[PDB]
């Protein structure tokens, strides 16, 4: 939902 980008 937020910025979950590794």
């Amino acid at each position: 939902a937020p910025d979950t980008r590794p």
Partner: single-chain antibody
Amino acid sequence: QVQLQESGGGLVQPGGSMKLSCVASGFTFSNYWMNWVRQSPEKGLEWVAEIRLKSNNYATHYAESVKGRFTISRDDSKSSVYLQMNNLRAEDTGIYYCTGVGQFAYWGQGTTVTVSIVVTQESALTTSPGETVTLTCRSSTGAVTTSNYANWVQEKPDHLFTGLIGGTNNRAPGVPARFSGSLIGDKAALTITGAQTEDEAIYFCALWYSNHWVFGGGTKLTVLG
């Protein structure tokens, strides 16, 4: 060393305008959402605004405290994020930080602006070297879940912020292994397994509610002996 560096703050009167900038290096800036967060004379952190990616047509979201007055933008070709502040108020006073990545790993040093849901953490805990201490983060809405993407951020002297944990339990790279995130008893928690003297610091949690962040009031950890 990823680096974020804010600029543009100063000493301004109520009613005025001012634009902050922040230049990023060391990570692929354009692949991450960026945020402004501000620290007021009261020591607390308040999330201000976010901006998404080019692929999200740069969608933005604001705290209710600044909606209608602040505009966040970014320029991927310059690895820079911005905050246009209009109709400044005394309550806008604070240190402004740009921060992002999984979800608050990286913080600038901040730029000072002087104008002239409740997330609850333990006010203070005391430990000593070698002990195991656990800090907790409660939501007024009910139980914390992985859908709140709990983050933990450490503030060292002087206004030195580093993200420890994002996505409930994901350690930011280079973060010592003694730090761990969890959900415990419907709260988010951060555990230091073997506290060290240098862990004396203020620890903030942040919880995500669909399209905004709310930071807790922080926990002062003392490490005695």
